[PDB]
Amino acid sequence: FKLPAEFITRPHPSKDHGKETCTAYIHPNVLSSLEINPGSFCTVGKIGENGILVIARAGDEEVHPVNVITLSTTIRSVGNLILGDRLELKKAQVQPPYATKVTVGSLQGYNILECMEEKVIQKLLDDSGVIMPGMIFQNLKTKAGDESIDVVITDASDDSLPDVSQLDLNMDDMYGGLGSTHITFSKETQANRKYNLPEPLSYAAVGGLDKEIESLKSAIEIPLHQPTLFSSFGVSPPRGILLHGPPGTGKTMLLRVVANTSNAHVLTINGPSIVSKYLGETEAALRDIFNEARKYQPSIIFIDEIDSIAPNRANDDSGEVESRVVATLLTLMDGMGAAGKVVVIAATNRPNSVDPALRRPGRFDQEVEIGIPDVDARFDILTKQFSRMSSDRHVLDSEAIKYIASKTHGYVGADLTALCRESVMKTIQRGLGTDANIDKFSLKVTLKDVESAMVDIRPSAMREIFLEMPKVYWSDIGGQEELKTKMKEMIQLPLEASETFARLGISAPKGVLLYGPPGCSKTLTAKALATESGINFLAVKGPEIFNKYVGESERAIREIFRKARSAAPSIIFFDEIDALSPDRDGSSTSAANHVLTSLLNEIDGVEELKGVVIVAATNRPDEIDAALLRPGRLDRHIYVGPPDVNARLEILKKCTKKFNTEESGVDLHELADRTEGYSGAEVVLLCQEAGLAAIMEDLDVAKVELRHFEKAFKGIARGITPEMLSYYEEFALRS
Amino acid sequence: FKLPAEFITRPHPSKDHGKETCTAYIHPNVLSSLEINPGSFCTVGKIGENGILVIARAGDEEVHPVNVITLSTTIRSVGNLILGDRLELKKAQVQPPYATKVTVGSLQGYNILECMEEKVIQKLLDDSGVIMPGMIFQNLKTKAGDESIDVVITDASDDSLPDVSQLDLNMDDMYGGLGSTHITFSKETQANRKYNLPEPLSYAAVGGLDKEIESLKSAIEIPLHQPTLFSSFGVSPPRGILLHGPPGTGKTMLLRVVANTSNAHVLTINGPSIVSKYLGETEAALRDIFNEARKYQPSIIFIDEIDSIAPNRANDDSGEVESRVVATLLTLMDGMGAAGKVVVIAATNRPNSVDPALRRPGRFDQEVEIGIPDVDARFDILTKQFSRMSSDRHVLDSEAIKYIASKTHGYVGADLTALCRESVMKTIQRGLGTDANIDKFSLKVTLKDVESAMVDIRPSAMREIFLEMPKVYWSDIGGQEELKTKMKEMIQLPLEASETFARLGISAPKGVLLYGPPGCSKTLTAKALATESGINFLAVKGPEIFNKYVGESERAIREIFRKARSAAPSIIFFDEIDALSPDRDGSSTSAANHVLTSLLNEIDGVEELKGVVIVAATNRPDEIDAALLRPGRLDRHIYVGPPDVNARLEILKKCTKKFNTEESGVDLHELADRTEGYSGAEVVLLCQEAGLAAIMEDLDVAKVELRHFEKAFKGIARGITPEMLSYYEEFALRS
Ligand SMILES: Nc1ncnc2c1ncn2[C@@H]1O[C@H](COP(=O)(O)OP(=O)(O)OP(=O)(O)O)[C@@H](O)[C@H]1O
Ligand SMILES: Nc1ncnc2c1ncn2[C@@H]1O[C@H](COP(=O)(O)OP(=O)(O)OP(=O)(O)O)[C@@H](O)[C@H]1O
Ligand SMILES: Nc1ncnc2c1ncn2[C@@H]1O[C@H](COP(=O)(O)OP(=O)(O)O)[C@@H](O)[C@H]1O
């Protein structure tokens, strides 16, 4: 009449040896309810993963609750079982026929033990059960030397009739006291790929994320493993940790890693599955999971897609499962325990869509920010992936890895794995369709498939409000020497003399204004500074922040200011301020005035932010209001006129990188002399036109001829007039 | 067949001794239904944390109904049980093994009893129970010296095998009349933090709320304790109290403290959780709650999230749970009784979001308003927090507290608590990473972690209507003596001649206006006046009142005017009046005209605000309409022009305070003489630019040289033209 539905796993206590494989503590009523003899094998469905881990069963001592079951740490780790997964029990399969080879693998060790062995076979196969796909055991105490040693038993040779049961349980035979089947120590094989066993996630897979993953590790370590330190204080420890960022950054993998590396109980909600038609069913499920987490002292709560289950209260009054659930859960967690050891993780894609009641400092104080990987992080990810896929299947060199990382500017970490997979597909196709099913070992991995993959991937990460570490070197930029020297001076003053300024009480100007021709040297300078300084860079587009709704731009400005404040000292750059600054001449609406007063208040109004640096670039400097155009804020002004010969030569070389300079025969000096009064955008347009003319001659071309460049120069005009130069000169004279 | 659903606690009547620990006046039918011996222990589920206050059971005299149960005031105080809490009976647990040490704590006392103790052990352990966490007993009557003494039994070393029992009750075995176990009279420590017992809240915990908390105390004391006070005049006592203010200020603490300190029944609704699919079920529960509250004379009603459950009728006509619940609750509260003794507390985040039908003189006339804490209140809050934290874990001198309070101009109590929490987190992680898990007591809490915490706290309360300025004294202010006696006269007339105005009929003109070139220190003088005068101030900006929603600006203006009226005679200053005033020169929406008409009607129409003083400053006189430029309303005009020679000399002192004048070699008056066409803001800009030049010339210096000041003067223009000064003089002449 008990009718058990689901079970919860639990590690075997008391340590020592005991049984350690077939504990399977089950209430006698449940033992009789399954119509299977207790002193025999048992099966744990765990709603999937067929094979069902055939293991022997044993009785309890009347102190084991029905809802829990012990499947031993070894089996829990081998089967990729995490504390909190739903477990189901049913009848057992046929008895194991026999074992053929059973050979160790010597995980994370150099092997060659011999003396250190001391008959591992006895301590390994003496246990009842011991399923042959995988055993891992603690070092215990072997001879003199202590240390930690572990072995794995992947490799198999026997054949089992039931294809559904891939776990192929085998029996153990012995002859002795205190000889296997033709030894067991051989080779240092890794996890076998034949059975496709689930390899537990580890921190080694994630690379380039070190600082914030370490911070999260500490912030999860200090509540749970050492609660007495806080219990001495007793100041309401934090329970919620924010994990948000762009999609594809790998938050799910981080959650899996922190769940696997910790033996404590965790909760994995399915999201909308908890939502039910009944009014009180959701509350019953919430209180059930909460009291389950409270009953077992070490517990962790994982919540994903908060914006879906718990949307914003004001944004949408959908009803049913709504902010009432938020209120109930907050009230429950606000008094569930004084100190305890409980961790709640809120992993959401966009905190803005989340109810701002969730984003309260009192409860959800801890916040972790995840951004798109930079060049170093991308290189680390690629190297880790190459190490994981092993050198026997590829022939690559590290310089190609830097080249690939540099070629990927806006690529996300999720894009790299797909790029590798599609490169594998391209290599497989290029081998098959060409050589008629030749051996794939020789072809391995090359660079042409990777190049084709990055050409045809077409990522959807181009549109974004924040780009992280643009890549442009000083051998690619174009500008005048005085501007470069000045920018170096005012980037080296604050970051190297903040303490000196604090001692003198003068701080930093925190304002730079740029104005010049629309060609170049006004926008690419920000990217050059971002690449050189290695500091966080914020780019804001004028028309982008404009919205039909009035007041949205104010919220965007507040959000970007908060991001700049919370994202360490950085530099803030605006692409075009001339599209929002004019509020009188342009007869703009109240939104422009609100934006102007907001930026005026944020720059030097009743608040001072020494760490951040504000730099702006504009095309026409006159329409900016005098309130913003005041010395003290953006006081520094640079004339920065049209690019000179070497800068134009440099941008021509940059545009000629795809082509070959020596094949064309151009010395880069005649073209620079001919193109002197033009602009950088005009130079790019001329290069594009010359390339089009070259490729329309005889289809694909390996080089561009000088006649095409001459035709492009003649046909296309600069479009610039001395009037704008005189206007800039007279504006600079009055300033 | 009775099927008891839930039970509510009640203090043990008749005083005396009786049981006083194990009264347990439950109906015998419930005892028989649970299949447990009446002379055995009992437990209350109270939703979660099973094992609360294992206490022996007994029977009643068939008079007390099933719903109400009694567990005595001692157990009520021990378990922090709120009156009328929902309790679910559970089966008993096996008898306690033994008591190990037993030692008193001497709550709220200096201990050292000895002579007047007179063997409290016999009376302490003669009663059944004596639980490990503690007991609370009244002083009763022992010898002479009256007064009140209480003892708690916090510290003990009893071991219990099951971790489910959170209260681990112990048995009683002592020898006495009318040899122990290692005595019990020792130490005077507080509640043990190892067992993390829930300490009830106290009025001393909340700081900086003295006036409003005393008003709330009086408002909740008038109806209940002495209903005759209000029933003598026979005008019916109020039943509802409105609590409102910024989120996370004091509401939950007020509710919890008034619930704990009052022996009356306390009931808190679950808000939207009560709402179900059945329309009539919630309303039937509402009559059930009202009948339960009316049945017992001492009762407290707590209402939360009023806006969520009772929105504005006109704002949203959704359906289902709607104004019908408002009408039924209004009818229930209108005719519950004639005099009675019942207080209803309504804590809402937004008063305007609440349905105005609720805000009625006959129902919810009483309102409690709590603003954002000022410097003094925040300092008191921080000092109370450090007092609670105690000096055994950290050291903090008073000046650091004052500096932190001054820095945290806009922080809220929740923000301060979160900042302290993540300060402790940062200290713990820093110590761990720097010393490999060293003792945290030696490192404790310093100012560096606090500074890092306030840098990375990411404040969210900056966008607030109420703002507090930095405090500046007249010595810090450099200004001319001209008009100083005038402004002293205007500030001293309403405040120090209210009776003279009332008798003579002169009243308050309430008209002060400021004008002149930007940087003429009008805002600085207003801030200095507000700081020195020691009077309440309301910070109003130009665009701040301008709201995107139609009518929101009018509501904000009405709210700020009501706050000024109810916050004693004060001063209201507009930072930028040159935005709301212009309605004819430029194209403006009808909202600006409505605001102008409303302010014109408020300043002098129909009503006169004698107590408060209206002062404003403008950047251009043409923007002010002729309607406001009339005698009686802003008739007084203060020139407050550019600073004089002596004023600029005094200004130069403040900017040079960080530097040292002696080694500079300048006389500090010749530089001021050379700078006569500038303004105070312009002088500050010149000093800042000179400091920037000094730090950019040779980095670290201890002084600014004459050459730097000369270069700053040469490179910066005054930016002021005589024509605008002439226009200002002409405008002043005509008015
Ligand atoms: N830092 C990384 N290193 C390696 N692979 C990564 C990284 N970030 C993402 N990936 C790749 O992206 C995929 C994992 O994406 P995952 O779903 O975990 O991302 P997420 O940002 O948490 O988003 P989602 O909301 O879809 O869960 C895998 O293919 C994985 O290889
Ligand atoms: N004056 C204060 N001193 C110390 N801590 C405070 C103070 N005010 C608020 N807090 C902190 O903020 C938390 C919540 O604040 P508070 O209880 O005052 O909010 P509330 O307005 O009643 O709640 P809600 O956000 O639900 O309306 C407290 O538990 C405490 O940690
Ligand atoms: N002599 C001075 N020393 C220091 N600060 C000054 C001085 N004069 C003006 N200020 C600062 O400049 C501000 C003056 O504001 P103001 O420009 O008059 O406002 P508005 O733009 O409405 O005219 C004040 O907030 C004050 O802090």
mmCIF file of C-alpha atoms and ligand atoms in Angstrom, chain A residues 236 360 362-363, chain B residues 205-207 209 246-253 304 349 381 385 388 412-415 417-418 421, ligand 2:
data_model
loop_
_atom_site.group_PDB
_atom_site.id
_atom_site.type_symbol
_atom_site.label_atom_id
_atom_site.label_comp_id
_atom_site.label_asym_id
_atom_site.label_seq_id
_atom_site.Cartn_x
_atom_site.Cartn_y
_atom_site.Cartn_z
ATOM 1 C CA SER A 236 22.354 36.228 7.672
ATOM 2 C CA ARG A 360 17.691 42.914 -4.361
ATOM 3 C CA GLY A 362 19.540 42.109 0.755
ATOM 4 C CA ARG A 363 18.908 38.596 -0.585
ATOM 5 C CA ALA B 205 17.775 46.785 17.247
ATOM 6 C CA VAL B 206 16.149 49.433 15.035
ATOM 7 C CA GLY B 207 18.005 52.743 15.069
ATOM 8 C CA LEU B 209 13.530 55.512 13.582
ATOM 9 C CA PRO B 246 10.954 53.640 0.150
ATOM 10 C CA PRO B 247 11.338 49.860 -0.178
ATOM 11 C CA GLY B 248 13.303 48.067 2.517
ATOM 12 C CA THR B 249 13.369 50.864 5.108
ATOM 13 C CA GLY B 250 11.679 49.627 8.278
ATOM 14 C CA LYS B 251 8.347 47.931 7.621
ATOM 15 C CA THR B 252 9.165 44.266 8.285
ATOM 16 C CA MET B 253 11.099 45.125 11.448
ATOM 17 C CA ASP B 304 1.189 43.233 3.371
ATOM 18 C CA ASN B 349 5.677 50.056 -1.039
ATOM 19 C CA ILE B 381 21.983 52.444 12.060
ATOM 20 C CA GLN B 385 24.911 47.228 13.532
ATOM 21 C CA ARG B 388 25.182 43.940 17.456
ATOM 22 C CA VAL B 412 19.237 52.257 2.450
ATOM 23 C CA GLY B 413 19.265 49.918 5.442
ATOM 24 C CA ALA B 414 19.000 46.870 3.192
ATOM 25 C CA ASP B 415 21.867 48.238 1.096
ATOM 26 C CA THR B 417 23.258 45.260 5.494
ATOM 27 C CA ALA B 418 24.155 43.771 2.104
ATOM 28 C CA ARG B 421 27.563 41.009 4.422
HETATM 29 N N1 LIG C 2 17.533 50.291 9.870
HETATM 30 C C1 LIG C 2 18.103 49.141 9.496
HETATM 31 N N2 LIG C 2 19.175 48.699 10.191
HETATM 32 C C2 LIG C 2 19.750 47.551 9.823
HETATM 33 N N3 LIG C 2 19.414 46.728 8.827
HETATM 34 C C3 LIG C 2 18.354 47.189 8.157
HETATM 35 C C4 LIG C 2 17.651 48.355 8.418
HETATM 36 N N4 LIG C 2 16.607 48.511 7.520
HETATM 37 C C5 LIG C 2 16.698 47.452 6.752
HETATM 38 N N5 LIG C 2 17.728 46.609 7.081
HETATM 39 C C6 LIG C 2 18.085 45.359 6.418
HETATM 40 O O1 LIG C 2 17.229 45.184 5.301
HETATM 41 C C7 LIG C 2 16.405 44.011 5.481
HETATM 42 C C8 LIG C 2 15.011 44.290 4.976
HETATM 43 O O2 LIG C 2 14.657 45.647 5.316
HETATM 44 P P1 LIG C 2 13.247 45.995 5.935
HETATM 45 O O3 LIG C 2 12.797 44.809 6.786
HETATM 46 O O4 LIG C 2 13.288 47.294 6.636
HETATM 47 O O5 LIG C 2 12.301 46.045 4.653
HETATM 48 P P2 LIG C 2 10.740 46.159 4.364
HETATM 49 O O6 LIG C 2 10.487 47.529 3.738
HETATM 50 O O7 LIG C 2 9.931 45.862 5.557
HETATM 51 O O8 LIG C 2 10.541 45.071 3.220
HETATM 52 P P3 LIG C 2 9.983 44.956 1.726
HETATM 53 O O9 LIG C 2 11.088 45.120 0.739
HETATM 54 O O10 LIG C 2 9.307 43.581 1.673
HETATM 55 O O11 LIG C 2 8.909 46.046 1.632
HETATM 56 C C9 LIG C 2 16.502 43.680 6.965
HETATM 57 O O12 LIG C 2 16.308 42.289 7.193
HETATM 58 C C10 LIG C 2 17.930 44.116 7.300
HETATM 59 O O13 LIG C 2 18.879 43.120 6.940
#
